[PDB]
Structure 1
Amino acid sequence: TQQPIVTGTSVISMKYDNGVIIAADNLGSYGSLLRFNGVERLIPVGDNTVVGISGDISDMQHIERLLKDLVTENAYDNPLADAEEALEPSYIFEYLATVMYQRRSKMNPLWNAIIVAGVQSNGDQFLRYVNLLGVTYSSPTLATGFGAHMANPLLRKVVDRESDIPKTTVQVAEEAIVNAMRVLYYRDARSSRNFSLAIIDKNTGLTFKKNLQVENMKWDFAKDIKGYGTQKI
Structure 2
Amino acid sequence: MASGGSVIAIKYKGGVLMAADTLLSYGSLAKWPNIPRIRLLGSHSAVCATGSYADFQMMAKQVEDNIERQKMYHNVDELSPSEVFSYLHRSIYQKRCDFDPCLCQMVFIGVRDGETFLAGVDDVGTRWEDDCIATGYGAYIALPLLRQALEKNPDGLSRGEAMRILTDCLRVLFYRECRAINKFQVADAASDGVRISEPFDVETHWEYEGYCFEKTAIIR
- Report TM bin, short chain: over 0.9
Q: 1:226 aligns with which of 170, 194, 214?
A: 214
| Map 1:1-233 → 2, pairs under 5 A | 5-80=1-76, 85-121=77-113, 123-160=114-151, 164=154, 166-202=155-191, 204-215=192-203, 217-221=204-208, 224-226=212-214, 231-232=219-220
Q: Shift of the alpha carbon at 1:77?
A: 3.2
Q: Shift of the alpha carbon at 1:195?
A: 1.3
Q: Secondary structure at the match of 1:210?
A: coil
Output the CA distance in 2 between the equivalents of 1:18 and 1:146. Answer: 27
Q: Secondary structure at the match of 1:125?
A: strand
Q: Shift of the alpha carbon at 1:205?
A: 3.3
Which residues of structure 2 form unaligned runs of 5+?
none
* Letter of the structure 1 residue corresponding to residue 141 of structure 2: M
Contact 1:34–1:190 under 8 Å retained in 2: yes
After TM superposition, the score normalised by the length of structure 1 is 0.87
Q: Shift of the alpha carbon at 1:31?
A: 0.5
Give per-residue Cα distances to partners, 1:139-183, cap 9 Å, x unaligned: 11100011101100111111139x82x431100001111111110
Aligned residues: 219
Q: Percent of counterpart pairs with the same letter?
A: 29
Output the CA distance in 1 between the equivalents of 2:156 and 2:51. Answer: 33
Q: Shift of the alpha carbon at 1:6?
A: 1.2
Output the CA distance in 1 between the equivalents of 2:157 and 2:218. Answer: 47
Q: Shift of the alpha carbon at 1:230?
A: 5.6
Contact 1:29–1:35 under 8 Å retained in 2: yes
The structure carrying a bigger helix percent of its residues is 2
Aligned-residue RMSD, C-alpha: 1.8
Contact 1:119–1:126 under 8 Å retained in 2: yes
Contact 1:140–1:160 under 8 Å retained in 2: no
Q: Shift of the alpha carbon at 1:225?
A: 4.0
Q: Shift of the alpha carbon at 1:223?
A: 5.2
Distance 1:28 1:230, change over 3 A: closer
Contact 1:6–1:28 under 8 Å retained in 2: yes
Output the CA distance in 2 between the equivalents of 1:131 and 1:12. Answer: 14
Output the CA distance in 2 between the equivalents of 1:201 and 1:169. Answer: 12
Output the CA distance in 1 between the equivalents of 2:218 and 2:25. Answer: 37
Contact 1:10–1:147 under 8 Å retained in 2: yes
